[PDB]
Amino acid sequence: RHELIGLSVRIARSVHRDIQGISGRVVDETRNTLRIEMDDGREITVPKGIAVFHFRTPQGELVEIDGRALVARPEERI
Numbered sequence: 001r002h003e004l005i006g007l008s009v010r011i012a013r014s015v016h017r018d019i020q021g022i023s024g025r026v027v028d029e030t031r032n033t034l035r036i037e038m039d040d041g042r043e044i045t046v047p048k049g050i051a052v053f054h055f056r057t058p059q060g061e062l063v064e065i066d067g068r069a070l071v072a073r074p075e076e077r078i
Contacts, residue, residue: 004029004063006039007055014051014067022046025053031073034065 010023024044025060027037034051037043046053071076 004005004055006037007034007057007063008038009034009053009055011046011051011053011067014053015047015049019046019051031076032071034067 007026009026014020025038028035034046034048048067055063070075
């Protein structure tokens with residue numbers, strides 16, 4: 001599986017319009033918050049409360065994640 005720290009991620013629609021349709025790299029993932037960082041050294045946060053986005057791996061992989069319908073709470077228990 002391998003974590004997703006550094007991978008690329010694109011948003012199709014998010015709770016906030018300021019981030020809606022945003023695109024960038026990954027840094028960290030939270031139960032209700034998506035953290036975006038790019039190897040360039042640029043980091044930016046993006047709430048997961050209602051944000052669908054797919055990740056891209058240089059190796060040639062296509063991953064998808066839902067911030068609207070797949071909002072799960074791990075450490076916080078279900």
